[PDB]
Subunit: 456 residues, 3 copies
């Protein structure tokens, strides 16, 4: 009598169904223990962590997080790890929930071009993080080597309408947030736990806009929530909703009716959500600068009838979500590609600036640049802008306060500095503004902003 | 059948009673669902975050945290948000516990001089954070835009003798801890989660000394504990006591008999305390440098009979609480004002130095400067001090070790450096010491300390 | 009727049995309340925080964490604190679980050479942190002044086969991780919560290798887990296993069947582990850079029969644990001593480099330097190494990529930079490699690495 003692494996071996985020393999739907064969392949590959920002990820199965594994408590798992011949590093795995030293690390050590296997019985029901366990472990985990394995209870989880896979991670780029180009891993930021990005599913906007999760009013949604870390603890929160329940790993304790829950580094939870009114529900790390300054936001979008007795308000918009209220920011991807190619047009910059202007600028100056007479000066046919377009660069970088006059109206207010914006973002935003609302046109270049940022 | 389905509103509309911290509105004390009208006004205003340190807070209702809202599960809330015409920024609100996208953010968007409303049914019982949800959200939250809303269970919470409102926040000033003057918000420290202050209720000493919470031996105290963040998770702890219970948001789980509990960023809990012996109980973030180096301490002061069989010890003092054992440090406020005015007297400095000397210096050199023969040299009629008063500045900033002689007694010990003290604090402490215990008198200036700090 | 109201003390006074980590005093094994006399002495002393790295710890009872205290709920504790005459600082104590202001702080204030006492009834059952409460509190806690006190329930905890004492802390050295020499406390890193070390029981390798905790297959292990902080929250995790249960302080909630659990700063928990298969189980802070870059790993080593049906895999090794897979790194201690003495031999460096080569280098280049043809170039009789031994220093510090040829085989791969290695570590590793596998011999000095690190 160990736990998860259900018998020796019966029937034929089952090849495990591994899914890519944000999807989950189907419930095993069986009453007997099985020998489950898992084949997982490590791939090292460049992917976009943000628009026009590439990163060399180390992946289980080509994604961050890695492929989702689903087995049944009592199963015997024969775990095959392949390391693709293109890999430069060796890799291995530690699966939380494994009973044995290293969670499989020693026996799963796998050089590029090789394959390893070890076998384990899944004694422990629950949701568990797996990750690479190769020195230096922090580097392998920071580069994206984590995912979830579910060990079902023998009777399976209660049925829901949808099951999704969401995994938080902290990332450490040499360059700053949204600085374009291929970004190396930064060991110094990693050791200090100062990530440049905090993401769901390996990228900014991975689960926003046209990539949101979906359900309908009345449906139940189970989310398998991982925190791969490596270093951060998530104040994991759903905006505008509540979790019916939150259960950590294989724990006996189940919390019900909470909105904010702490997920340890390396931790995992199953949360349940019941859709009650339509609109966009935001999954965040409520350490707010992560959610709103580093990418740590995901969307569950609910379709169906409004319930005015429950909520009279409008759908989420750019005031809260900023530039992620849109379907995508693919104009920024295209403008960055054109810059690298030396083929950047005015229109490339305009469309990029339009994407970034949302929230960042429109919260005060409005979508149409009209502002609000006497409170927020207009950017639309702005005489003050026209009178010295170049100074707009200083205003964005270093802010503006004091008495000014715009389209012959008096303002005495404060525009905070926005120095975190990269040279290309300032250039594109300002090029957008100059080419909108009958402004004079022309363009601002990243190089122009670089020169101004460097002026003391 | 949604939750909190108690009927349509009955009776007349109720104007919500909003309280300022640390007080709470009274229990709604009713058996029927109501239409509750809430009017909350945003005010941007300078307040003292520390003695002689001003900060431009963004507030719900003129305080940090913002006004406390109390309604009943099943109530229909008509939420009016006004943004005062003096505001420079637009603002809005996201109330945790609201069922709907953004927790009210889109419909509550409110320019300076304007008013917005949206309606929501309070389906979810519990204690919930609300906060501003205006891009850039981290900035609005960092500037103080958070508070708590309680949704009572339909039968109301159990009666206690006292209900208080305590909310932790992390703050990001350009200047260092206790550097005097009007301190701007520092976006860089905020993004990096490196706060200069960690406070309860928007200021150092907000809940210490003459501003402590009160109760008596035998009474029960309920505290509504918020963490507005934006970024920090509180290792929330009561020194010298225990919580009878800790309940997060609307959760079904209630923890009992704990002293230390983790509150997520954006999280809230109700804690219960039973006073058993008199004295000062300290609420801290037990990430100790926050509690003892950044302001994260609050006091619950208990009156009544000593129980020597339970505790024989003395009341908290300056050894633990340092300069917050006193009623206030208002001498520091007055000395800083006089400096700005150019009217700083020797006595202004003396009284300021006396406030700061407690804990900081008195732990070793004693309240009376006598020290302890052969262990801690005296500052009282100190020949070593008199022999070169100027060098006292180097001793405070950079510490002192090695063999010295003072009032013809031998010392060979270590005075740690105290370089975190600002120029004005060193000047005032040393001016206090020179004017006490028959020392030679004179004064040390901030400018003198500035010159020494700059010497290599 | 207060809690823990079991009567007045009966029988003779009991002198409390205090143990040194990782051991625990025996169960009190009694059915009556007692007067328990505790005598705890503060000692300030240099100890090795890492091999060849000394730190001036401030200790309760000569260890970090301090001596373990065990009493029974309902006991009257007469607490004597002595501060050894060698101390330079005054000290005192705050015991979590004490009912009274400061947890004993005011009455336990104790100058060097003095003794204090206060009395308290242990009303609250549970595991509790104690720590020093002397301004500046963060400094005293950072220097090691914490431990655990257990208050047993009146019937005692359930019997287990083993009880161990593990306490996490964050430490703040002026120098970087593994920089040799006597390291001062760094107030700036402490205030910023940027520790250089994160340790169990006051040192790197305190609970690894020949110092691992032990049990056998089938036995139950209770671990009293403290987090003294001062600042960090532990994502406390056991690699390759599960906790049967996790109970915080005196809480009524008990979590069962979890692998990862958040321990607040100043928090404590009792965890239970049932050994099911042999090998090394790693206790970590799963904020991974702490566990793998700063020292936050401890071992529970299980003896007994392999269960191939549960786990087919091999024992933990250097791939995961790196240089802590070995019994000790005492060659590094000896090489550092010899350097300070000016008697550093080639063999001293070789044996030190051999200790550090494990994981750090062997994960790719193998234990025998053979590498893996076409993937990892060999260090064994390496023509590329021999061709310019000096350049090996640049390769270690700054990494190597691009097409190279070694023992006439083509490589085009990436060796990451390893700039975190100190001058002495690079020197010793390279001296080890030059003196192994028929390489040319010679030696590299710390001074050689210093010059290269400084080259731009
Ligand atoms: C509200 C917090 C604002 C955000 C976000 C942005 N701007 Fe702004 N801007 C704002 C104020 C209150 C003022 C007037 C400052 C004063 O001294 O009273 C401004 C000013 C400008 C100007 C110059 C005036 C004009 O042409 O109307 C420009 C060109 C401008 N702002 C542009 C701008 C851009 C491009 C932004 C996004 C990057 C942006 N602003 C944000 C208030 C706020
Ligand atoms: C205990 C940790 C101390 C605190 C806090 C402060 N001081 Fe100190 N001081 C201390 C020691 C052990 C010594 C002797 C150092 C040695 O080499 O043995 C000192 C020395 C001084 C002196 C010079 C000697 C004298 O005049 O008595 C001065 C002027 C002094 N200390 C002042 C001082 C002030 C103003 C402090 C608060 C800012 C302070 N000290 C803190 C021990 C400790
Ligand atoms: C895998 C991540 C590695 C670790 C850890 C270390 N090394 Fe390495 N090394 C590696 C590769 C893929 C290469 C070839 C780089 C290329 O451009 O293809 C290297 C190269 C070296 C060399 C030069 C070649 C040789 O002599 O074989 C030396 C001297 C070397 N490496 C030494 C070295 C030492 C001492 C390490 C621990 C500090 C170490 N390496 C780690 C891959 C990896
Ligand atoms: Cu890997
Ligand atoms: Cu892990
Ligand atoms: Cu706001
Ligand atoms: Cu929120
Ligand atoms: Cu101490
Ligand atoms: Cu404490």
């Amino acid at each position: 009598k160990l736990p998860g003692d259900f018998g020796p494996p019966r029937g034929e071996p089952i090849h495990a169904v591994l899914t890519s985020p944000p999807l989950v393999p189907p419930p095993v739907n069986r009453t007997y223990p099985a020998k489950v064969i898992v084949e997982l392949e490590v791939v090292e590959k460049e992917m976009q962590i943000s628009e026009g920002v590439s990163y060399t990820f180390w992946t289980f199965g080509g994604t961050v997080p890695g492929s989702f594994i689903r087995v049944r408590q009592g199963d015997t798992v024969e775990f095959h790890l392949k390391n693709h011949p293109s890999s430069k590093m060796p890799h291995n795995i530690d699966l939380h929930g494994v009973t044995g030293p290293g969670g499989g690390a020693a026996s799963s050590f796998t050089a590029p071009g090789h394959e390893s296997q070890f076998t384990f019985k899944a004694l422990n029901e629950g949701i568990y993080v797996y990750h690479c366990a190769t020195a230096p472990v922090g580097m392998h985990i920071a580069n994206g080597m984590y995912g979830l394995i579910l060990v079902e209870p023998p009777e399976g989880l209660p049925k829901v309408d949808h099951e999704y896979y969401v995994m938080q991670g902290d990332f450490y780029t040499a360059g700053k947030y949204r600085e374009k180009g291929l970004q190396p891993f930064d060991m110094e930021k990693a050791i200090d736990e100062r990530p440049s990005y905090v993401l769901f599913n390996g990228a900014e906007g991975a689960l926003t806009g046209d990539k949101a999760l979906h359900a309908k009013v009345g449906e139940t949604v189970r989310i398998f929530v991982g925190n791969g870390g490596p270093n951060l603890v998530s104040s994991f929160h759903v905006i505008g909703a509540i979790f019916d329940q939150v259960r950590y790993e294989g724990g006996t304790n189940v919390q019900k009716n909470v909105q904010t829950t702490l997920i340890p580094a390396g931790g995992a939870a199953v949360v349940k959500f019941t859709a009650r009114v339509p609109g966009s529900y935001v999954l965040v790390d409520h350490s707010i600068f992560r959610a709103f300054n580093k990418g740590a936001m995901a969307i569950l979008k609910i379709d169906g009838a409004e319930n005015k007795l429950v909520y009279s308000g409008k759908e989420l918009d750019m005031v809260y979500l900023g530039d992620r209220a849109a379907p995508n920011m693919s104009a920024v991807t295209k403008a960055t590609q054109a810059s690298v190619s030396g083929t950047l047009t005015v229109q490339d910059q305009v469309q990029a600036g339009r994407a970034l202007f949302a929230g960042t600028c429109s919260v005060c100056h409005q979508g149409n640049g009209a502002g609000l007479p006497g409170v927020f000066p207009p950017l639309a046919k702005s005489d003050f802008l026209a009178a010295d377009p170049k100074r707009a660069m200083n205003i964005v970088l270093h802010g503006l306060n004091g008495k000014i006059k715009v389209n012959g109206q008096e303002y005495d207010s404060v525009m905070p500095p926005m120095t975190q914006l990269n040279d290309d973002e300032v250039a594109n935003i300002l090029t957008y503004v100059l080419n909108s609302w009958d402004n004079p046109g022309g363009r601002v270049s990243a190089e122009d902003v670089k020169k101004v940022r460097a002026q003391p």
